[PDB]
Amino acid sequence: SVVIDYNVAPPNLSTLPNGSLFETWRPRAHVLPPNGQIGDPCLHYTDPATGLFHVGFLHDGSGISSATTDDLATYQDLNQGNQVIVPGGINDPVAVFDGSVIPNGINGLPTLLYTSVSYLPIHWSIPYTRGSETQSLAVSSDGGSNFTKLDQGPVIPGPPFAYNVTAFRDPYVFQNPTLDSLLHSKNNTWYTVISGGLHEKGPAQFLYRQYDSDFQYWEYLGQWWHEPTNSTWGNGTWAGRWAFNFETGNVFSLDEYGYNPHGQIFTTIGTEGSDLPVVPQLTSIHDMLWVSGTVSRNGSVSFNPNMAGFLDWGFSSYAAAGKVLPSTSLPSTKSGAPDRFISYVWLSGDLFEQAEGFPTNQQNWTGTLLLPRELRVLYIPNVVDNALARESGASWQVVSSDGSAGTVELQTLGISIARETKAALLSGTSFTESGRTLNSSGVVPFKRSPSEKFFVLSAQLSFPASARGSGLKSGFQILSSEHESTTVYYQFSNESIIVDRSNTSAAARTTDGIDSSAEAGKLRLFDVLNGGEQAIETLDLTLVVDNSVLEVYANGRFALSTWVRSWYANSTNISFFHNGVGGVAFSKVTVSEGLYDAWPDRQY
Amino acid sequence: SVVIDYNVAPPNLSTLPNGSLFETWRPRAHVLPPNGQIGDPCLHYTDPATGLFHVGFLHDGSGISSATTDDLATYQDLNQGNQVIVPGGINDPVAVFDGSVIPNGINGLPTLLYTSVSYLPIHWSIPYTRGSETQSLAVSSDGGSNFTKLDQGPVIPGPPFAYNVTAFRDPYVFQNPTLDSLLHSKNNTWYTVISGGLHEKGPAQFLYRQYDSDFQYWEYLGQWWHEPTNSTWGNGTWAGRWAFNFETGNVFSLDEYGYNPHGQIFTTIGTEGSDLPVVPQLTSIHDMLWVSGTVSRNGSVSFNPNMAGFLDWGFSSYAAAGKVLPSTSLPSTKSGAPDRFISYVWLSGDLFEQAEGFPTNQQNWTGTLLLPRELRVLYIPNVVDNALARESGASWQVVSSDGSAGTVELQTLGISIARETKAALLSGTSFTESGRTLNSSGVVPFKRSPSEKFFVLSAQLSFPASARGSGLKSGFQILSSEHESTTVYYQFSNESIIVDRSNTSAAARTTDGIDSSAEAGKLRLFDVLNGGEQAIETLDLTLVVDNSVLEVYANGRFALSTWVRSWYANSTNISFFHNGVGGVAFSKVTVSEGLYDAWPDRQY
Ligand code: NA
Ligand code: NA
């Protein structure tokens, strides 16, 4: 069968045999199935009996598949990658959508509450078919390889009486003593949020609590959070739009270290956006947002947002699912971590099924999850109390102020690679490129580049005072050779990290459905006071390249992830990049090469 | 194939070929399918476009079959007797139970609301499987031969939040301006009652009204009528028990002539009874009750029973379904009838599936509906105001009184054969047996008897004053020959009509599962004042024999129906019967022979 040589120019990839491009763009350090398509992650839980962390995801549009980890770095497939629960039962004859797990449930077994689907199609833009989405229970008695459906109807057969929902799915089970105290619930009551919205009103999270010890009945507590149709946090700059429908709602509570039941309450959601006029059955904008809020009561409970942002700025990033990972788990016991909230963002492989022409049968897989991320409250001290710091409707807020110093402490969402995964990514070969200051325009090669498309690059960029309000662009050119290059840079004129993919892939010239549009995410660098002098915040950059999967992290509070589908074997060189407009000081750049095998017990 | 000769003794009927006993016991003037089993009647409606009255019934445990009538005497099968709606859809993958029809519904078409079943088994005596019974919509666009299910989920997906129901089925749609005025509903609002009960509380009718013009949402109005588990009207003499579960609830309103929207409100129900201790999945008592009541409001509406009885006293009579038949219908236009409420009682053919051994495959049919019955308010004037008239918790009530005459007017439920059916039953040959008074004991042959097992017998029995409190038994012996006889008599010692079936069938000697136990129904004959003298009420008796189907009517307010499965061709003779205890005066007895063919367009 056919010979592949990545030093030779590519054909139209649609002409190659099935499976011939299996390895071409495939990551080694990310969660994705053995083959085929990955959809929304869900079902994650820690098994209290074994300590193993279980992860799950929709697989091939035909149910939920799953894997375990004892270290939060590497994974073991359950049921050989085949689905632990499939459609075709009485409650879910057409489909299985997201569900979440009560780890210590019916008979002390993991108990899945999930969206069972009986009628398609389903979309916020069209009229809703009554009973199309219900919430049903299943239980695993075999260690999470098979979830057996209860032989009864759904436990939540529909939305509240006469509600004209846009959607009613993705039930997310969670505990919270702040809710308990506000609602006089029994201690350690399980809550469920269901995500969707209302036609002619707008997106919403529907809130419930268990009524009975049996998980059979769920008492409706109201739309604890809802926003008008296509409205937006602030003026729309820092947290996209609330848009036409909420999906994949997660609810959890954080402090400075990780997860805390008494901590500040957060939610992550997908929003489904669109231009006007609306194109039937099309969601053109898939925003992956996080939201901080205060929960109060005046009859019924409300979640009132006080700041919001993106969990990942990638066009193709969406549908994140996360779970409490307790300190007692196997991974946390090995690493000494406190209680955490670990979230896996989904990276759709085909633009949410809008990449017609992509050589899908050649690759024989579609999509990945991003690296597990730890979520925590992040504080930014010694920020200069000016208009940059004080902007309303943004992704941070002032929590204290020092009139004498002229400073504020800021608060925002901390987003970083989970620690055991980060350390396993840095495990191999390790070299440093010298710091330097650049004033003129162009790319300057590193003295040494990684020899393969599997690396981490870490660097600090320091900008001088004149950078503010200039047309400066500075960063790195990666995955470069004669025929290809990808540029990642910060741009002050629109306060953004940009990924320029115009030259990323030689395959995009010969083949349809290989996207080359720019990716972008907003990032403000504040003014800070250190050693008694005022300066622009250091841009602390971490780039993880995993064959075709690029994740760009910054300052412990920013992520932008995308596909970088470079063809040529030589497209591995790294250079400094600066457009010449002002100057920039690069610290020493660390490069770690090779990453690690996240699936050590797989063949491929 | 085998020769049948009804002058020769029967074999064990279980040894004969399949279908060989098709005609043996089969009626000609009753509603039953072309072959196979009949279950609960339902689905009846008048088509406003054609004027045809449609009847329906469960058929072979596999959906609802239907037929039409233009005269309320004869019927035409729809869809050749095959079901107009079957199980195996998304909402009803396991079964279809009773439903009722809004005649002028979605797109002005007949619209069925019915119980769609997803989980079996279902019974009041066991724990209820969540979601086993829902209420779904279907619509017929082809004149009632096929009801197309709406391609959506159920419109009532379950009982109210956390209710531990015994049952939740048999939705009965009805209109009522008395309810409209009490509830401030829109004029001509459709109501639905659903029948069942609650574990640890008792049987109930759950009441709803349409929320929207679309029939999509049904607003819950409470348990408008409920009774404690296994309680009873009065002391249990005149209306059985309310028992452990209500089934087949009908609601309607009557005056003296027939149906009236502003009239007195009535309901008919089956009750499921049992001995203590309860045998799992067994209902041993199937009572077919009617109930009169007043409807009032104190927050939510209540139906408060003021009298109750049996619609039919037959052990095997149950599950009646009826419908408003307007004066504008085809049958009513021909007969000049006002608005009516026509009810068909079910006569189970096999003791509600407890007649093991019966030669079912030999007969190739099971069960029938009884003759259509007109329900109306019946007044009994000039009754002597004594303790017989004044008994509480009975099947009548005093509505006015005359202190001077020493009398009361009574009110009760009028039950008679629908008029066009009655006239078609009397259509043929017609002869009279002379009146006589009998004082000694024994049977006295009629001078002429009918030559076949298809006849109506009408007679008046007048009892002298000494009959009261005596051990008198008087009536008729029918279907008699050397080897067989059936006796129908009134008995003062327990105020009952009795059917003695001990000698009815020679087949019961040779064959299993042919019931020969006595049937009974309570009937009080009041003291009346006529021509200025006091007397025992005339017993006005009507017996309709339709091969094996016996229906006994009395005084326009009593029905007792049963199976009389006589074998020998000669078992057709009629005699007077009197046990000698006192005396009895028989008026002239009318006998009409042959009845009529209720299925003129069938082969068999
Ligand atoms: Na996105
Ligand atoms: Na009965």
PDB file of C-alpha atoms in Angstrom, chain A residues 176 251-268 290-292 339-342 374-379 411-415:
ATOM      1  CA  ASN A 176     -22.524  23.103  47.000  1.00  0.00           C
ATOM      2  CA  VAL A 251     -21.047  24.569  37.959  1.00  0.00           C
ATOM      3  CA  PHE A 252     -18.329  24.456  40.606  1.00  0.00           C
ATOM      4  CA  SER A 253     -16.636  26.488  43.335  1.00  0.00           C
ATOM      5  CA  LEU A 254     -13.017  27.661  43.680  1.00  0.00           C
ATOM      6  CA  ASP A 255     -10.451  29.284  45.973  1.00  0.00           C
ATOM      7  CA  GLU A 256      -6.850  30.322  45.243  1.00  0.00           C
ATOM      8  CA  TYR A 257      -5.550  26.709  45.268  1.00  0.00           C
ATOM      9  CA  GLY A 258      -8.261  24.750  43.447  1.00  0.00           C
ATOM     10  CA  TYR A 259     -11.735  23.443  44.227  1.00  0.00           C
ATOM     11  CA  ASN A 260     -13.468  24.529  47.475  1.00  0.00           C
ATOM     12  CA  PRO A 261     -17.118  23.762  48.330  1.00  0.00           C
ATOM     13  CA  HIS A 262     -17.334  27.115  50.272  1.00  0.00           C
ATOM     14  CA  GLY A 263     -15.501  29.027  47.550  1.00  0.00           C
ATOM     15  CA  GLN A 264     -16.513  31.505  44.889  1.00  0.00           C
ATOM     16  CA  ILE A 265     -19.029  30.025  42.411  1.00  0.00           C
ATOM     17  CA  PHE A 266     -18.213  29.717  38.698  1.00  0.00           C
ATOM     18  CA  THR A 267     -19.834  28.203  35.631  1.00  0.00           C
ATOM     19  CA  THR A 268     -18.492  27.214  32.199  1.00  0.00           C
ATOM     20  CA  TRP A 290     -16.351  30.919  31.938  1.00  0.00           C
ATOM     21  CA  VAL A 291     -18.381  33.114  34.327  1.00  0.00           C
ATOM     22  CA  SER A 292     -17.878  34.182  37.974  1.00  0.00           C
ATOM     23  CA  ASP A 339      -8.872  19.348  45.755  1.00  0.00           C
ATOM     24  CA  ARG A 340      -9.042  20.475  42.108  1.00  0.00           C
ATOM     25  CA  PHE A 341     -11.508  21.225  39.331  1.00  0.00           C
ATOM     26  CA  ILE A 342     -10.130  19.629  36.152  1.00  0.00           C
ATOM     27  CA  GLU A 374      -6.738  23.202  36.558  1.00  0.00           C
ATOM     28  CA  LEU A 375      -9.225  26.009  37.370  1.00  0.00           C
ATOM     29  CA  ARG A 376      -8.615  28.238  40.395  1.00  0.00           C
ATOM     30  CA  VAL A 377      -9.057  31.826  41.597  1.00  0.00           C
ATOM     31  CA  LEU A 378      -6.052  33.836  40.299  1.00  0.00           C
ATOM     32  CA  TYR A 379      -5.001  37.100  41.971  1.00  0.00           C
ATOM     33  CA  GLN A 411      -9.111  38.736  40.577  1.00  0.00           C
ATOM     34  CA  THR A 412      -9.769  36.520  37.516  1.00  0.00           C
ATOM     35  CA  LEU A 413     -10.008  32.831  36.501  1.00  0.00           C
ATOM     36  CA  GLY A 414      -6.744  30.913  36.793  1.00  0.00           C
ATOM     37  CA  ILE A 415      -6.273  28.521  33.847  1.00  0.00           C
TER      38      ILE A 415
END
